[model samples]
Target chain A: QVKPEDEMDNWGRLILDGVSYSDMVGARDRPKEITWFDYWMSLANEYEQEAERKVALGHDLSAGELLMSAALCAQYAQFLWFDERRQKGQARKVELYQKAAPLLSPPAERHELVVDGIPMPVYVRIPEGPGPHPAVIMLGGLESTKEESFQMENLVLDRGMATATFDGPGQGEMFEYKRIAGDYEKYTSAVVDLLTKLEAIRNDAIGVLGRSLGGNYALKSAACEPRLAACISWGGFSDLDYWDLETPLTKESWKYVSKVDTLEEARLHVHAALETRDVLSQIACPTYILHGVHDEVPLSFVDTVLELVPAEHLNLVVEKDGDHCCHNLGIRPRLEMADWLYDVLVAGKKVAPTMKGWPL
Target chain B: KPEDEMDNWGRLILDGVSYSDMVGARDRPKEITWFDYWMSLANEYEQEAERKVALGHDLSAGELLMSAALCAQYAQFLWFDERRQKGQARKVELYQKAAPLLSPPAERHELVVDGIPMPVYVRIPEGPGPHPAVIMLGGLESTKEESFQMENLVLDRGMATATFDGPGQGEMFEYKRIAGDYEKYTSAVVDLLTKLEAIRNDAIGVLGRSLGGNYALKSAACEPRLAACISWGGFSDLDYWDLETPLTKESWKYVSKVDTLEEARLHVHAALETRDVLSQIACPTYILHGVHDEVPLSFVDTVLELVPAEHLNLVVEKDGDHCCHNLGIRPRLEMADWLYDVLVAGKKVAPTMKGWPLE
Candidate 1:
C-alpha cells in the first residue's frame, strides 16, 4: 500500500520547485502495483497530450508550460528508481525537454561540452537584452541533474544573469563517472571556458552556484579558477569523512557514481579525493556559504571551510531552522545569493566580509 | 494553487462575469443547440489537449482540458429539457480525463443510487491508516468536476474528499430530474461509503452548495448517521416566488419536468419546503450564506426560524455572493476545515476568520 508519508519522505520538500503534492500523493505503491516511475510517466503522457492541444490552439506560452511540466515529471519518474532504469527515463526526459524549450519565454538553448572525451549535457537560459551578461554556472548533486536547476536559474535569470546548468561527472548524462573526479574543477573549468567564448556570456565575471554535493565542486572551481568572480556552496561539505557515515543508499550511489563495484573502494577513493583544506585556501574570490544547522552533512565539514577561507572573502549564512539547502524555506536564500552575485558580478560592488545567522 | 495552474473560478470571479454571460452566450443561433454548441467548444479544446499529449506538451494540454471542463459546466445553465444531456456527459468525461493529469490525481467512481449509477470523484489525503472523508456536493450548474481546486485544499489539511453530482445535476440529470426525494439518494451514497474500508465511517462529513446545500440540510435532518452538515447557499423553500430570477425559474421548470411557468410554480410550491424537516436535524450544522445572495436570503431566514439555535451555525458574510464564491477560497477552506475539525480531528474551530462570523 502506498502511504502519504512516503511522498513526504521522497518529494514533499520539493513542492516549491514544481514537485506538486498532487503528483507525489497520486503516485502508486511500487512492486505490488505500478511504481512512482510508471506513475510519473503516465502523468507525463497526459501533460504532453495537453501541451499538444495548446500548440494546436496556437497558444505558445501555454504549450510551453505544459511541455515543461511533462519534461519535469518525466525526470521525476526516475528519482528513486534503479540506475539502469534512470538512463531509460533520462531519454524520455530529454525527449520532452527538447519540445519544451522553444515554447518557453525567451526560450532555452541546449549546449554540450566534451570534457576528457565525455559529453556533458548543458541547458543555457539566456537573460534578456543581453550582450556579454554575467553568467552563473548552476549544478545539482547526488540524485539531481541539470533539469532540476530551473528553479534557482529563474531567480538568476530575473537578476539579468545567464545560467549554464550542466551535468558533471557521476551525474545525469555523465553517470559513467559513477563518483566525483579527483580534479572535478577541470570539468567546471571546461564549462567556464566554453561559456566565456559565447557571445551571450561575460568572460571576466563568471560565478558558480551548486546545491548538495554540487556545492562541494562550486567551491573547488572557484578556488582553482581565478576567472570566476564569486561562488556559492548551498548545503555542501568540504570533508569526505562524512562518506563513512552516509546511509546505504548514499554509499551505494557514491559507489555507482564513483565507477567502483564495491562501497569500500568507493569510500577510500572519495575520502582521498575530498581532502579540501588546500583547495579552500586557494579560493581568493568572494564566496557565499549556505549551511543548514540541522543538515545531513555534519558541522565539522563547514568548520573546515571557515578555517581555510579568508575572512574578507567569505559570507557564511547559517540557517538555524533550515534543512539541507533549506529547499522548503522557499527561494529567499537562492534569491538573496543571486542578488549578492549580481551586485558583485553585475553592479561591480565590493563584497564585505560577513558571517550571519538567519531570522535576524 | 492558482500560480501552479490556471483557475476556473478565478476566470469567473476575477473577470466579474455573471452566470448570464454563460447562458446568454448560447442564447444566440447556431447549427447546434446551446448545449451541443458548448460540448463542441469543449471537444475542440479536448482534441487540442489530446494532440498536445501526443506531441509531449502535457502542461498546456492540462490547461486546455480544464478549460473544456469549464465550458462543459457552463453548458449546464440551460433548462433541464433544453440543456444538452449529452453535452453534460461529455463534460463529465472531460473532467475525469483531466483529473489524472492533475499533479495529485483524483480517483473516479460510480456510486449506485436506486439502480442509477452516479458519477463521483474521490481524492484521498497522502497519509496512512483510515482518514476522515468529506462528502462534497455541487450546485445546480456545478458538479464534482468544478470542485477539484477545493478538493486540493482539503487534502492539504490531511482530510480526504469525495465529490458527487446527485439528482438533476451534471451526469445524473438524465436518470432523474430535481425532486423532493433527493435526500434518499444522499442516504444511499452514505450507505455505499460506509462499506469502503479506507474511509473513517463515523467521521464522514457532508457539505452541499446551492441546491445541493438544500439536500445537505435535508440529509442532516433525516440521516442520523451523518457526523456534520453544511448548507452553503441552500434555500429553505420556494415561498419567495417573486424574487426568483429568470434563470432560476427556467432552471426549476426544466428540472421539475414541467413545461409552463404556472405548472413550475405549483410544482415548486408542493414539492419543496424545508420548514417541515429542519427540526429533524440533530447534528451540528453549519449554514454559510452570502449576504448579497439575493436568491437565498429568504432561505437563510427560514433556516434561522426553523433550526434550533444550538445545533445551527449560521455564517453570514456581508460581502459574499451566492455561496460566497465572490470572496474566493477563504470561506470555502474555512467551511471544509471546519468539517475536518469536527469529523476528522473531533474538535471545534474558532470563529476567528477574517470575514464576519455571526453568532
Candidate 2:
C-alpha cells in the first residue's frame, strides 16, 4: 500500500495520448518499420523515407490486408500496453468512484464461498433500491481482478441491473489477502451458487463475462452450470489447459487449502476437468464468444470449440488492426462490450444485437 | 547577447517565490548567506566532483551524478524537508568523504567583481597570463558539474574556464545563500572573466543547453562582457509562459503545482510583451534548435524572429527532441567549434551543417 504522504501516479506507463498525430514533426528522417509494397513510414513530411531494401513483392495483399498484418504482428502488443496504461490512469478514477459512490447511490459487494473449508470471495454491486436486478458473474482473466475491472465496470448499478464483481480463487484483494487461488469448476460453480443466493438479482438473469484465459473459463462456466443466463467473453481462449500443462508455474501452491504447485499443475488440473465433462450436454444457456481477427490462440482449438458449441454462439471480430485485443484499442471496444453485456444481462432483448456483431 | 537569455534570467528566481509577498525587502533567502545549505551540497559535489573528474567523458559522470542528485532530491526533498534530516545528513557525510579526493575550491577568491567570492575548480592553460577563458553557467537545475566536464570546453579551445552554481541552483540555493539574479548572474560571470587571471575577460564566451540555454541567451544578449553566446536548443518566451502550450503531460504537472513556477514567470511580462526584445539580442546570435524539443521549442522557434546579425541556426531536425549537445559528441564538438571561433578566435560564424538533411 502506498503511504498517505506519497501521491501515486500512472498513465505514462502505456502513454495513451503520448504520440499524437503530430509526433512525426521531426522523426521523418528515422523511418520506423511499417509494411507497404515494402516501405518505411516516418512522421516526416516526405513519405519516401525508406532507408533500406524493401521486402519481397506481394501486391496480392490489399491495403486492408497490409494494415491487418502490421496491426497483428507489430501494433497489438503496443495496444495491450495502451489498455493497461489507461487503467493505471483510471486508478484515480477509482478514487473518483469512491467519492461519487456516496453522493449518488450505495454500491454492493457480494461475497460467496466456494470450497467447504476455504472461503472464496465474490463481490456484487446491486442496483439501488431494487428487487431482482439483472446480474452478471464477472470473472477476470490472468491479470484482471474482480473488484477492479476496467472493462466490466459500466454494467449499470443505479440505472438498473446489479453488477457482480469477484475474485474466484486467486483474484484482487482475495489472493493478496489469503494467498490462495481458485480452480476452474470451483470458481464457476461458486459463481452459480452466489447468483442463486443473491436476493436482489432477477430470476434467469446471471450472465458471465471473462477475457483471455477467463474467456475459456466463462465458456466453461456457462456450460458447467445451467443456471448461467448467458456468457460473453473478450478475446476467448479454448482448451488452454494444453498450454498451461506444458508451462510450469514459477511459484508455490495453496498453504491455504488447494494443491496448485506450479502453472503446469494448474493446467493439468483444469485439463482433467474438461476431460471428465460431457461437452455436448454441459451447455444450456446462450453464449457469446468474441476473438480477434488474427487470434494468437491456436486456430485448431478455436475450430474444435466452435464445432462443439452451436455456430450462432461463436463471434469473430476481425478488426482493421487485426490486433489480439482489437476491441481494447480504445473506447469503441469498451462501448461494444457494454452493449453486449447490457443487452444479455439487463434488457434481455437479444434478437441478435442491433450492432453488427460480426465482421472486423 | 540574445533576447531570450536576458529574458530567462527572469526565470532563474522562479524557484525563489517563497518571498513573493515580502517585496521591497525581497531577495530574502538571499544569495551567499545560507552557509549551512552548502555543507551537504559541498559534500555531495565533493563526491560528484571526484567521480566526474575520474570519468573524464568516459561515462559523462558530471551529467549522471548531477541528474541523479536532482532526481534523488525530487524523490524526496531531502535537504529542503526539515523533518527529513537523515538523507541530507548522510549525503553531506558522503560529500565530505569525497571532497578530499579533488582539488580545493577557490573560496572568496578576488576576481573582477568587488567582494565577490567566486568558488572555482580551476586548471590554467599550458602557458600564460591572459589565456582565453570560457565562463559557463549551469541552468536552474544544473550544478557546477554542468560546468563539470567543461575543463575540456576550455582546454580544447586553448583557454581557461570556470563553473559556478548560480544563485538558485546548487551550493547557492542550499548554502552560499545566493538566490539567482538575472542581472547579477550574467554580470558576475562576465566580471570573473575579465577580472580573473585564468580568464580572457574580453575573449570570454558562454554556452547553455536545456534550461541553461535560456540563461546563455540572456547572458550573451544582455551581458556586455560576453564575446559570444550559443544556446544549444535554447529556451524562450518567458512572458507567454501561462499561455504556453505544455510540452508533455508530465511538464504540465510540474509547472502547474509549483507556486514559484508561476511567480518566477511574472518578471517575464516585459520581455514577452516588448515585441522589440528580439532585436536587443546582438552578440552574433547562434542558435542550436531541436525541432522535436518539448518545452523549449515554443521559445526556440520564437527566437527564429530575433535580430539577424550573422545568426547561426544549426538544427538537428531528426533528433529534435532536445539535448543535442549530449546526444552525440560530434554535435557537441561542432557546437564547441562555433563557440571558439566566435569568442576566442574572433571569427564570424555563419550557421554550419555537414551531414544533416536541412530543409
Candidate 3:
C-alpha cells in the first residue's frame, strides 16, 4: 500500500539525514497528487543536474554537496518501493555517492575489500593532522547504507578522529552478493583489520557505532572483535523475540534483505540469526546504548541488553520522547553520542555508567 | 490565508535564509501564530545559549545565540506593529551577545552618518594583517545580525568582512528614512574600513543582497575606493514597484517610515534608482540574479545594458528564487570564491558570464 501523503511529515528526519531544507520545500510545493517516488526522483534529478553543472565549472566542493543531496533524494525515492525501481534507486544512490566521495572536504577515500570473497565497499575520511588519529567505524540500519553516513563522518572528523563507513552483507552495494547473515561481526572485524594496517589511524583507539539493525551488528562486533575500544548502539535490539510487534516496513525490509520468498521464511531466518545473549558478556569495550522509551522496537530490548551486558561497560540512555534512532530529537542526541565517542576513544577518559530517562 | 497557504509558509521557513538551527525550530511544537512560533524558538535558543555559556561551551553558546537572533529576525520579518520593534530589539541584543564569541570574533562599531547611528560588525580572519575586506549589506527585511553566517563564509576564505546597518535599515531605520544619499553612508563605512590596520585599503569590496544590491552598485559608482562590487539578487531600481509582492510593498512602507503606501512608493522610486549611477562604476562588478526571481528581470537587463561589460560578471541561475537562498549554500560559496579570486588571489581574468546550472 502507498504511504499517505503529508508533505511536511518527513521534513525533520529528512533534514537529519542530510537533505537540504530548500530541497524539501521544493518537493513539498510541487503539484498535488504526485506519487512519493516520482516527487523524490524529480528532486534527485534536479540535484544531479546542478551537481553536473558545478562539476563543469570546476566547483568540485559544491558539486560534492549537490551529489550527496542527489544521493539522499534517490534514497528516499526507493524507501517504499520493493520492485525493480528499488534496485535502480539503490544503484543511482551508490553511483552519485561514489562520484561525490573524492570531492568532499578532506576527501573520502574509497576502499574495496573482498571479505570471504564477497566484495565490501567502504569509505574512509581522515581528519586533518599528523599520523595515527583515533578512528570510528559507522554502521547504517536496515534501509541506510554507507552513503547515509556522510554527515556522521563529518561529525566524527570534526572531533579529531578518522571516520570509516562501510556496507556489510545485504547492505547498499553488497546486497547483490550477500544476504543478511548470522555472523555479521566478521564483516566489521574485517574493516577493523583493514583500519589497523593504515598509518593514519590509531589501531588501539578504534570504535564502532551502528544505527537501528546495525546497532545490533555493532554490539555483536564489539563483543567478538577485540580490536574495537568503544561501542555505541543507536536504537538497536538484543534479539528478534519481539518480531511480531515490528512495523510492516521493518518486516518487509527484513524480508527483502534476507532474499526470502515469503515473510515466514524471512522471520525464521532473522529470528535464528539475530541474537546477542551468547556474546553480550564477551564485550570488554565501553559500550553506550541509546534507546527511546517510545521506540517501536519496544523497551524490552533495552532491558535485555541491560541484563546481559555488564553494568560497568554500559552507558544506557533512554530519551523519553525519542522515536526510533532518536531522530525526533534532531541533532541533540547525535551530538551527545559524538561527544561520548570522542571522550572514550580520543580523550581516553573513564566514562562512568549513567542512566538517563530510566524511570519512564 | 488558507490552511494550505500557512502550511506552505511554514515549509518555506524551513528553507529560507540559512539552514542549521531553523530546521530544529520547525520540528518543535507548533504555536498559535507564525510570530509566536518563531518568538518561542527565539526564547528557547536564548536560554540554551545561556546554559551553554555557563557550561563553558563558548562555541556552542555563540551558535545558539545566533540561532536566537535568526528566530527573532524571521519573527519580525512580516510584522509592522510595535511587535516588530520588540523582535528587532531582541534580535540585535542576542546577536551582540553572540558577536564576541564567534570564531574570528566580530568587533561591534557604531559610525554616525549625518547624525544617524549606523551600527556595524567587522570580523577579520586569522592570518597576516592588511587582508582584503568585503563590506556586506542586507536586504529589505534582513539586518546586520543575519550577516554572521555569510561573514563566516568570507572569513573561511581568509578575508575580513564588515556588515553594517545603513540608513533605512536596522538601527539606522529608527532615526532616518532612506534617501538617494544612502551611498554617502556606505562611503563613510568604506572610509572607516580603510582606517582599520587589519584591512587592505586597496582591496576593499562591496556585496549586498536584494535592496542592498541596488545600493551596493550605487555606492561602488559613487565611491572610487571600492575595488570590487557584487549584487546578489538585487534590482537595478525600484521602477518595478507596482509589480512587487505585497510583502515587499509593506516592507518598503515600513522601512520608509511613511504613512501611506503611495508615499512609500514615491520615496523608494526617488531614493533607490541606479540608472544614472550604473555607468560610473569603475571596479570589477559581479551581478547574480535568478531567472525566476520575484524581482523583475528588466532590472537585471538595465544593469547588463548600462554597466561596462568589460568590468561586469553576470551569473543567472535558471531555477533560483529570491537571493538564490533556495539554492542553499551555492550562491554564497560562489560569491566568496569569486571575491577570493579577484581580491586575495590577485586574479586578473574575468569570470565566465554563462547562466548557472547550465549555459
Candidate 4:
C-alpha cells in the first residue's frame, strides 16, 4: 500500500481553482526536509516580489494577476495548518488580494459589515453594464475563503451578473471571534441586507451559492432569507451523520472551526448545528444541488436533500466521475452553474428541474 | 526530446486551449499514438459541434468547431504523410464553418499575391468605423484556424483583427513553399486592410507567434504604413538550427516541401535571416521571448543588436517555455496590453528591457 505521505487529497480541487499543475508537482516532489507551508510560502513570496516589480513598472493589470496568484499560493500554504501559522497565512492572503482588488478589470470592492459584534469581510464585483444587475452571494467551504472565489466571481460577472463573496462566521477573518454556529444563515442575511443598499445590485434578483459545508448554509439562508431568488449547494451535506467517514484533516478542520478543544465535543456541536431537513422544506426558491459520487461526504446526504426539497424546485446534478465539487471536471460544472443561474435570474426562464441526471 | 514525447507539451496544450476539450486525451491508452489520440479527440469535438448546431446552439457549436480545428492542427503537427493532409483539410473545413458563427463573427476573404491565392479572415470589433486593427500571423505549425483566441483578445481590447495564411503556412502550404520575400504577402493583406472603411490605416499593426514572429518583424520593417509590431517567440535567423527538436526539423521540411532536412535548413536560413532587415523597422516593436525557448536566445540578441533600442520593447520570462505558452494566458495578456498601449492609446513605446515573473 502507498504511504499517506505520498498521496495528496486535494490535487483536483487545487488545479481546478487555477493553481498550476507544475506548481503542484513541485510542491509534491519537494524535499522531505522542508514543511508544506515553507515550500508554498516560498512560491508565494516569489509571486509577491514579481507583483511588486510589475507594479513599479506601472503594469497594474499584470501586477493584479500576479498578486491574485500569490494570494492563491498563500491560501494553499495555510490549507490545513491549525496553529498560528494558519492565521498568518490567511492575513497575508487577505493583504495581497486587497492590493489586487482595484487593479482588476471591473474592479472588486471590499465591504465590511459587523454582525453580532463580529466583522464579516466581503468582496463585491459589479459587471460592466447598466444599474441594478442580478447578484450572486457566494460562500466558501471549510478551507476555501473569500479570496479563493475570484475565478467563480468572474464567471458570474461574465454572465452579466454581479457577485458578492464573503468570509462569514468561522471562515477566514471571522473564525477567531465567531466560530460557526447553528444560525449561520444570519450572516448570509446580513450580507443580503448590505447588498440591498448597493445601487449596482438588483435586490430582488439575488442568489446564494455555498460550497462543501457552506452548501448547507446556502440552503438554510435561502429558507430564512426570502430575498434570494435562487440557491445552489455545491457538494454540500445535509447533516453530519457520516462524520466518522471523514478524513483526519477534515475532522480536525471541523473541530478547529467549531472552536472546541476535543473532537468528541466538535462532532456533537457539528451534528446539532448542521441539519438541512427543516430548512430544505422551507426553501421557496429554485434550488440546485451538485454532488459527486466520489465525494468524501456520503451520497446519502444528497438523498436527504432530494427528499426534503420539492421536486419542482430541486435540480440535482450527479457527476459519476467528479470528485468533491466536481473539481476533477475543471471549469465545466462551475460554468454550468453560472449558466443555470443566468437562465433563472436574468433570462427570467422557468426551468423544469431534471429528475433524470445527465452527464456534463 | 521530440515534442510528442515531451511531458511539458501537455501542460502547454491544456493551458493554451480548453481544459474540457483536452480531458479525453489526458488518460490515453498506452498503445495509442499521440497523433491518433489527438485526432480522436478532434472527432469527438466535431460530433459535439454537430449536436450543438442541431440544437440551435450556434455559439456553442462555433466554439466546439474551433476546438475541433485546434485538435486537428495538433494531430497533424508532427506528421508529413497523407494523414497530415487529411488533418489539415479537416482543420480548414471546421474552421470555415465556425468562423461565421463566432461572436461578432469573422468575414472570410481571399487575396491573390503574386498569382498565389492567400486565404484571410478579418473580424471587426463592434463599434463605430475607423477602428485600429492588428494583422495576426501563425507559427510553423499554427494556422489561421488557431488564431481565434488571440483574435478575440485583440477584439476585447477594441481592435479589429486580420488573420491570414501566408507562404509555407496553413493552407498556403498546398500552393507554394516558404519564400525569402514572405513580407510581400503581408503587404498585400495590408493593402486590402487599408481600403476597408472600418479600418484605420494609420493605426494598423502586425503580430505573429513562433516562426510568424520573424515574419511580423519583417512585415513591419518592409511595410512602412504599419505602426507597431509584436513577435511572440520569434527568432532572427536559423543560426540555432541545431537547437530545434527533431519534430520541428521535420515540420520545417514538410512546410518547405523539401526532400531532405538539409534543404529545409538551407531554405529557412535564407528566408529568415534578419540582420539587415531589423534596422529598417520604423514601427514601435515588442518582442516576447522565453529564456528556455526552443529558439535560441542568440536570436533575441541579434534583434537587440540590430534594432534601435528606442523603438523596441522586450519582455523575457525566466520560467517560460517556447512562446511562453508554458506560462499560459499571462504572456498573451502582456503582448495584447502592450499592443493596445501602442495602437489604440497612441502612447509612445519607450525602449524597455523587462524580465517576467521576476522584474
Candidate 5:
C-alpha cells in the first residue's frame, strides 16, 4: 500500500513514458544546475536535431527511432509542472509529438473534432489494416493527454484495435476552452458521434476507457451514452467527499479546472455536478472498474458501480498494493482493462465480466 | 581557423548509435563536445561492423557499417573545419570491410595512375558478360568509403560501380596533395577502367560529387572514350575559391597542401585547368547543383553554358543545399539510374530541372 517516499514521482510517471528511473535520477541534479523542465527540454531538443540530421542525410529508419525519444522527453518536460509554466512545456510537448506523430511505427494522425461547437483535439492512431476497425477512446486524468496515451495506444493497436485519445473538459488543451461543466458526459457523447463518422472506426463496437479523474468521467459518459459497447473506470470515486483525501496540487487543480474561486466552492460544485449514483444504475453495457485498495481516493464509488450494474456486466479489480491508478504496479492492470474491452468489442467474447472471487 | 567552443550540438543530445564514445569522454580530462562524441561512436560502429563481417553475418554487418558511416558523416556533417584525418581512417576501414560483405563483392584495387598509386574499389554487379561501369569520385575530403551506400544502389540496379581516391584527395592526400594536371590522373583512371575485364570497354561513365564533380567533368573532356559523365556541384575552375563557404577556405587550404588562401589560389590556378577544355568534352553529360547552395550556383551555371548543348543536361534543385546532400538519396539515385540507362540499357536520359525526391 505504501510506495517509497523517495521513489514517489520517479516511479509515478512511468505511465507517462517507460524511461528508467536511473536515466532521470542524476540528470538536473549534477554539476550543471538546472530545473527538471530545462533538463527534459534539453534532451528533447537533442533528439529533435539528431532526427533532423538523419532525415537530411536519408536515414528514415534511424530518424523514426530518434523522434520517439524526442517525444518521450518532451512529455516529461512538463509532467508535474502546472499553471502558466505548464502551457509552454505542453506546447513543446505538442510540437515534439507533431514531429513524432508522423514518424512513429504505426504513425498517428492528429485530428480536431468540434463537438457541440467546442474544439476537441485528439490523436487518432489506427492499426494498419482493413477499415471499420474496432475503436477505443482513451481519457487522461489531470495533466495527462494524448501524448501520454501513445504507449497504451501501441498496445491496443498491436492487438488489432484502433485507439482515439482526446483531452476532455478540464484536461490537456481543453483547459483553455472549457472547465468541468455539469454535463461533461455530453462532451464525451459528442466525441462518440464524431468517432462513428470516421471511416476507420466501427460505430457499433466502440468502448470508452479513462484513468483517475478521467475514469470518473468515463463512467459518467458510459452511463449516459448507449453507443459505447464497453466501459472501463480504472480509478473513480462517487462524489467530492473523496476530494479531501487528494494532494494540495490535486485540490488546487480541481478548483482551477472547475472554474471556481476557492476550494470550498470547488468542493460544492464538484459534489453537485459530479454525483454518479443515478447514472451508475443506467449503465447497461459491459463495465470494468479497477482500484487500488491503498489508493488515496476512497473506494466508496465501487459500491455504486457494483450495486447498480448487474453482476454479469461488472468486472472489478482491486489490487492490494495498487496506488493512484496503479501505474506504480506497471501497466498490467490497465492493460488487462484494455484486453477486457478488446475481448468484449473486437473478439465479440461474451464472458462473465466479473472476477472469480469478489466481496469475499 | 578555429571554430567556436559553443556549437548547436551543445544544446542537442549525443544519444544516438554514433555516440557510445560519449560514455568514455566523461572520464577523459580534456573536454569534448557532441561532435567528438559522435565521431568516437562512429568509429566504434565501424569496428563493430568489421567484427560482424568476420562472424559471417553480411546483412547485420552491412547495417552496422552503414551506421558507423552515417555517424561519422554527421559528426563532421557541418564541421566546416580543418581536416586532420579525424574519423577518416575508421570511416574508410568500415567501408572497405563492408564492401566485401556486399553481394558480388567490392574488390579493392591499388592501381598505378601516372605512376602515382591510387586506391580504388570496383564492385561488379551479379550478371553475365561484361557490365557497364560508373567511375565515382569524392569531394574535398569525402573518400570512396563514404559512398558505399550510393554505389550499392548503383550495383543493385545492374551496373558495375567503381569509387577511388585519386590525386589530391583521400588516401592520396597523405602522400601528395593536389596536382596541376588533375585531369591527366582521371585519364589514367579511365585507362584502368578500360582494362578491367568485368567492365564493358566502351560503356564507362564518370560521376563526381563536389570537388570530385570538377574532376568528373575534367576526365570526360580529356577522355572521349568515356560514354557518359555526371557532375554533382562541380566547379568549372580555380574561381571555386571565390565562392567559398565556411568550409571552402579550410578545405582548399588542406587539399592544396598550403595553409594560406593565396597559396591555395596559386595552386588551384596551376593544377585545375577548365578554360580551353570545356568544349572538348563530347560525351553525354549531366550537371546537378542546388539553387540555395553556398558553393555559388555559378559553377553549375557555367558548365551548362560551356558544354555542347546536345551533350549537356542540367538539374537544379530549388531547395537543395551543396550538392543536394541535404536532399539525400533520391536525386543521386535518379542520376545513377539515368547513367545506367545510357551506359548499359543503351538509352538516353532527357535534360530537365528536378526537386529533392526527383518528381
Candidate 6:
C-alpha cells in the first residue's frame, strides 16, 4: 500500500490500547502488574524472532505471492505482543498477514459501488472481455477491505474475468465503526450479494477468493452461497481454535479491534466448526481448494477441505510445495488461477491440471 | 561450473554475456567482489586491446583506433562545452575521464519539457545497441546536478542514465515560474525520454525522490508505458505535507530578495510554484525511505498503504531529515548501491538475511 501521509501510517497503530489495558486494571492493581517498557523490551528480540517465525509460517502457507509480503512485515510484529504470556507461536490464529497483503485483487476499472445504503468508495477492474466477464468477488482479510486492494484487485481481471472487490464491515474506515465486527455470513454475503446487482457481472459464473482470516470467510461464504458457483481460499482456515494458544498469531494483534468478537461469538463459531469438519458439505460449488500443502498454519485447513468439500465432484487440489498462500505469485498468479477458474466454472469441466504451479 | 546471470526487480540483462565465460577454467582468476568487478573487466579489456594492436589484425586495430579517437572527441566535448556553469560540463568531463580509454560516447541535453528547454543531461553508453536507460527525476527540491551525480554514480554500475532538470527544479529556477505539479513534470519527462532517438524508450524507468516520489507517482498514474519507478524518500500523501504550504504563506518575504547567505535556502523553498498540483500517480514503484527522517514517518506509512507491496519500500534504521545526508556514508551507499543494483545492473536483491521473507 502507498503511504499516503507522513504523520501516520495508512493503518494507524493502536497505541491507545496501552491506556485501555492499564485502565481496565485498577490503578492499585499492583506495585506494577507490568511496566510498559519492560513488557515490550523483554519482547524485542523475541519480537524480532517471533516476527521471523510468523513470516516463516506465513511463507509456509501464504495464500499467494501478493499476500505474502504483508505476512513478512506485519504478522511478525504481532508474534511478540499478541500473546506474550504463551511465548509459543500461534497457529491458525487469524492474525493480519502483511506479506499476503499484496495478493489483493487489483482494480482494472475505476468506478463506484453503493451498498448498505451508503455510497462506498469502490475501485473495480474487470478482466478482458469478450462475453460479459465471469465475476469473481474478493473479500479482504481481517481489518482489510477493497480500498486497500485498490489497483491490486485488477490483477484478477487479466484472467478474462470481472472482479467486484470492496470494503465490508471491520475493514479500513469501516473498522472505525467498531460495530463492524466479524459476522462471517453477513459481511461476506453483503459484498457477494453486491456482485450480482452490478449490471456488468455475469452472475452465474461468480467465484469468491479471500486471503488470510478472510480465507475462511470466503470459503464459508461459498459453502453457504448457492449463488457463488466456485470457491477458492488463500491461507484458508476452517476454525480459530488456535486463538487460546500462547502466540498472538493465534489471535488478532491489532490494538483497536474489539476483543468481544474473540471470546463468545468468534470462539463459538470456531468451536461449532471444529466439532465437525462437515461444514464442507454445504459447499457444492465446483470447489477449488489451494493450500500450502505444508503450510504451518493451514495444515488443518487442508484436511477439512479434502475430507468434506467433495473432491470427488469438484476439483480439490493442493500444492505440495506451497506455503501459506497457494497463489503467491502476486499479480500474475491471480490471472492464471482465474483462467483455470473459467474452465471449471463456465465450462463446468474437470480441471485438467491439479498442481498448475505454486506462487507461495 | 555454470556462470551467474543476475536479474534485478525482474528485468534487464547485464554483463551476463560472459558471467560463465571461464566457468571451468581450472586456473581461472578468483571471484571479483561487486566493488571491483567492473574495474577488473575494464583492465582485462585494455590488456586484450593492447594484444590486438600488437598482433596487428588491421581491422581490429582500426576498430580500436576509431573508437579511441571518437571517445577523445566526446572527452573534449564535455571538457569544453560552453554551458559548463555550476560545473555541468565538468560532471560530464568526470564521466569521460573515467572511461578515457573507451570509445567515444554521445551525450545529449534532455529537456524535461520539450519545445522550451529545461536542462536535462544524458550520457549515452559509448557503444549504442539501444541500451537500457533510466530517466531519473529528482523530487521536490533537487537540482539536475544532484541527479547528474547519481547518473555518474551508476555509470560504474553499467546503464545509460539520463537525468533532467524538471520544471520548477534547478534551471527552472532560471524561469520565474516554479511548478511542482508532478503529473506535468512527469509528462514532460516521459515525453523527453521517448523523444531521445538514441534511447531505448521501452526500457526506461523513472527514479523519483521525496516529493519527486509524489511526482513519480503522478507520472506512473499518467503514463502506463513507464517500465518502473524508483521512488526514494517517497511522500506518502501529497496533500498533508503540502510542501508548498510553508512557502505559500511566506510568498512575499521569499520573493527573490536573494542575499548571498540566504540564496541557497531561498532556492530550496521557491522551487515549487503555487500552480503545481498532483492527484493521481500510478506505476510499478520501488519506495525507499530512511526511518530517521525529519519529514513525518507517516509519509512512509501513507505511501505503504496506497502502493502495492510489490512496489518496494526499503526503510533504513538511522534517523535524520529527508535527504539522509546525515547518516554515515555506509548507509547512504547502501541506498545508492541498491539503486545501482536494480537500475543499472538490472539485478534482483538477495535479502541480507537468509530466508528473510520480502518485508
- Compared with the true structure, all predictions reach lDDT values of 0.72, 0.45, 0.81, 0.81, 0.70, 0.45
Backbone clashes in model 2: 31
Q: What share of the true interface contacts does candidate 3 keep?
A: 0.19
State the lDDT of candidate 2 residue by residue for B11-104, as single tens digits.
Answer: 2212111111112112325553222343334344446545545533212233223333332332223123343344333432332232223222
Off by over 4 Å in 4: A1-9, A29-34, A53-58, A356-360, B1-7, B10-15, B18-26, B46-66, B97-107, B114-117, B123-129, B148-158, B316-319, B327-330, B354-359
Q: Write the per-residue lDDT of candidate 2 for residues A118-227, one digit (tens) a residue.
A: 56655566654648777767676543444335224543442355666655544333443443332465667766676777676776877777765567677777667777
lDDT value for model 4: 0.81
TM-score of chain A of each: 0.91, 0.59, 0.95, 0.95, 0.90, 0.58
Distance (Å) between predicted and true CA of B196, model 4? 2.6
B1-359 per-residue lDDT for model 3 (tens digits): 32332233322343333333454445545645666777887898889778767745565567678778887887777777778888888888988998998877889877877676777789988767889999988878767887776777778777899888877788777787777887888888888988888899999999998788988899989999999999988887777778777777888998888888999998889888889888999889999998867787786678888998788898888877778765776677788878877788758747457583344
User: Against the true structure, whose DockQ is highest?
Assistant: 4
Window of ten residues with lowest summed lDDT in model 4 chain B: B3-12
lDDT of 1 by residue, A1-360 (tens): 334335324532455455544454355333457666777888789889978876774546557767777888887787555556777887787788788887876577887677888777677888767387898888778767777666677777866888887777778777755356778888889988888788778888889988888888888888899899888999888878776566556676678777788899988887777667777888878899999877768778667777898778998898876677876454346656776777777868786888888334
Candidate 3 pairs with clashing backbones: none
Best-first order by TM-score: 4, 3, 1, 5, 6, 2
What tens digits encode model 3's per-residue C-alpha lDDT throughout A50-166?
888877766666688788888888888876568878999888888888888888887989888889998788789988667889989998878888888887788778778899988
Task: List residue ranges in candidate 2 displaced over 4 A.
Answer: A1-360, B1-123, B127-129, B150-153, B174-181, B239-278, B296-301, B311-316, B351-359
Candidate 5, residues A86-139, lDDT tens digits: the string is 788778877777787777767777888786688887777887667878888887
Chain B, per-candidate TM-score: 0.82, 0.62, 0.92, 0.94, 0.83, 0.54
Tens-digit lDDT track for model 6 on A147-245? 344333434453456666655554543543443343455555666566666776777778877765567777778767788877777666776554553
TM-score head-to-head 1 vs 2, winner: 1
- Per-residue alpha-carbon lDDT of candidate 4 for residues A1-360, written as tens digits (9 for 90 to 100): 323333243666776677766677678878989888888888889888987877775667678778888888899888788888988988888888898898777788888788888777778898876798999999888988888888788877877889888887778888878887889888889998888988788888999989888787888898888889999999888888898877777888899999999988999998998877767788889889888888888778767877788788998888888777878775557867887788788778788877435443
Error of 4 at A114 (Å): 2.2
